[PDB]
Write a protein that binds this ligand. Structure first.
Ligand SMILES: Nc1ncnc2c1ncn2[C@@H]1O[C@H](COP(=O)(O)OC(=O)[C@@H](N)Cc2c[nH]c3ccccc23)[C@@H](O)[C@H]1O
Ligand SMILES: Nc1ncnc2c1ncn2[C@@H]1O[C@H](COP(=O)(O)OC(=O)[C@@H](N)Cc2c[nH]c3ccccc23)[C@@H](O)[C@H]1O
Ligand SMILES: [N+]
Ligand SMILES: [N+]
Lengths: 326, 326
């Protein structure tokens, strides 16, 4: 079958935006493709990380991947740092990307703005993501819209490498959801929902309790038009709530507008909050189970084993093509 | 004992400047220290390399290291790419160096000047050299003067890492020869002798034949003062020839000035050319022997084995300190 790769940074906050744009796709596609799902701890360190929190966040994210339903008999779940090939291929790709290509990355630009002394990993974040995808001969990379540009640079590098050294890499393609590719902040629906928003009301974490989810959904900024209809430009707040509702419930945006015909924001938010609770509760129960189990470590051990077998071989072919080593 | 590390890029030209500033020190110190001497093929690719020539140049350089006298029972000779830890530690160090620190590197500035689209590896050349030195708990790094600045950034990174994550690295120190730290071009003695000078008369390669060494020494730019006396500012050409003569012959600069008292440039150059021939001939004989032997591969196999054991352990401690993995 075709191969899928995708990764998530281990951090203190994993949002419903991460779930809807990514994790939901991973669970959907796992049985139909060869799947590698990575905990990108080397990318995490492109900004300072408290070492104790980083180690815990890596375990947390592995638990969340398993809690949402990633099945180790269907997919390979592993930690980026435990497969040396990622670092090795990243170096090779860094030698073929131009500085100007990295500087124009929007992710870099945003993460480094108003900064005084920027750390180099932030700039070289792309070749490492490109190595993550290309090591596995990846065909599809399911992500939310914010990663599209990185995937576009990955395709540019794979093409450049193939052209200079011979056809080695598969040119990967992004798979971005139709609805929910970009879940927006509940506090300012013109902004993406971000793990690092300083306002905790902007996002819902996958570990938010029921009272908390109710409070954040109820406080979500809307409009004065009291109509439940999708219109991103005119009604960003309601439109974003409709995307969250649709993707989590399985109901179309049309279905939801009909259902809420003549209805006001109060009932709509109460219902949505319950749909979020319904979704997160089981995830959280499974999450705690994994966090307390020795099996979490076993799953990651096996996934690293498989990923190392494949990636190490691609690295050998890349070295051979560039004429490194012997 | 103390530990020494040093590296050389595999390239089409290895000069008497490389020999005098570096290789000569490696042979001198090998019995007194734990020594790692590396063929930096990952650094080589920071600029485009023809893959076939790169593979040959790596073997050539390994032969030259053995030909000049590096003894595998005293030192560990290995290829950078064959030890994944270098790439892994380079990533970690790249996440803690600032972009501005890299941009001010003179090596980067020179290699990238008048350039149109610069390759990222050229900019991130330092963290990889820093990882090369720090992986082995290096105390001393014998090099010529042009690497001093990179070693200074390495010390800055080791200190920064120790300060943020705990004392792990030894702060390394450069060992730069008193005479011969910077062998100058024979064509323009105000310029460093460089492997990539477009004028082949500017350098002597370790594989230059006798007629060739005579021609290059005889053509070496001097002055109209016909006096053999060291004075870098006033007599750069003669001063540089005196450094080459001194370091290769074992005779002091004073000894040589006395010896050539009242003598002219002709006799002096004829003698120097013979001193260069005397030095390179045995190196070349041994060089061909290694190039035709299966033992060259065995030596590199064993050196990679040892280097991997040490470097992989340092990488595990670095990951532990940053909280990567598990
Ligand atoms: N508000 C949102 N709406 C919709 N989707 C969203 C939202 N916020 C986040 N996402 C998606 O979640 C995944 C993980 O986000 P990260 O920031 O860890 O995503 C990142 O930081 C990547 N660089 C990690 C990575 C490293 N290597 C890779 C290789 C393939 C794919 C991804 C990666 C991503 O799919 C992201 O698009
Ligand atoms: N004209 C000259 N006069 C005196 N010494 C000279 C002259 N030209 C070159 N050298 C010395 O030769 C060694 C290798 O030169 P490279 O350009 O490969 O040198 C380089 O390009 C390094 N970045 C390779 C490296 C990679 N990792 C390392 C770790 C430790 C030490 C060195 C390295 C160096 O010692 C260099 O100073
Ligand atoms: N699968
Ligand atoms: N030694």
């Amino acid at each position: 079958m075709k191969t899928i790769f995708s990764g998530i940074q281990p951090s203190g906050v994993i949002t419903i935006g991460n779930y809807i744009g990514a994790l939901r796709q991973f669970v959907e596609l796992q049985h139909e493709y060869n799947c590698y799902f990575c905990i990108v701890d080397q990318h995490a360190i492109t900004v300072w990380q408290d070492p104790h929190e980083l180690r815990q966040n890596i375990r947390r994210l592995a638990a969340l991947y398993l809690a949402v339903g990633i099945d180790p008999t269907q997919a390979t779940l592993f930690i980026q740092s435990e497969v040396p090939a990622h670092a090795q291929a990243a170096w090779m790709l860094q030698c073929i990307v131009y500085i100007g290509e990295l500087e124009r990355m929007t992710q870099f630009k945003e993460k480094s703005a108003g900064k005084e002394a920027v750390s180099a990993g932030l700039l070289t974040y792309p070749p490492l993501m490109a190595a993550d995808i290309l090591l596995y001969n990846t065909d599809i990379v399911p992500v939310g819209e914010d990663q599209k540009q990185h995937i576009e640079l990955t395709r540019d590098l794979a093409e450049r490498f193939n052209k200079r050294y011979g056809e080695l890499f598969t040119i990967p393609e992004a798979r971005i959801p139709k609805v929910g590719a970009r879940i927006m902040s509940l506090v300012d629906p013109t902004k993406k929902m971000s793990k690092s928003d300083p306002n905790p009301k902007a996002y819902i974490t996958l570990l938010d309790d029921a009272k908390t989810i109710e409070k954040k959904i109820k406080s979500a900024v809307t409009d004065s038009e009291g109509t439940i209809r999708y219109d991103k430009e005119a009604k960003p707040g309601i439109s974003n709530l409709l995307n969250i509702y649709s993707t989590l419930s399985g109901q179309s945006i049309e279905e939801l507008e009909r259902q809420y015909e003549g209805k006001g924001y109060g009932v709509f938010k109460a219902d949505l909050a319950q749909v979020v609770i319904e979704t997160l509760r089981p995830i959280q129960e499974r999450y705690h189970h994994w966090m307390e189990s020795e099996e979490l470590d076993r799953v990651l051990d096996e996934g690293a084993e498989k990923a190392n077998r494949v990636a190490s071989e691609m690295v050998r072919k890349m070295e051979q093509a560039m004429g490194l080593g012997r």
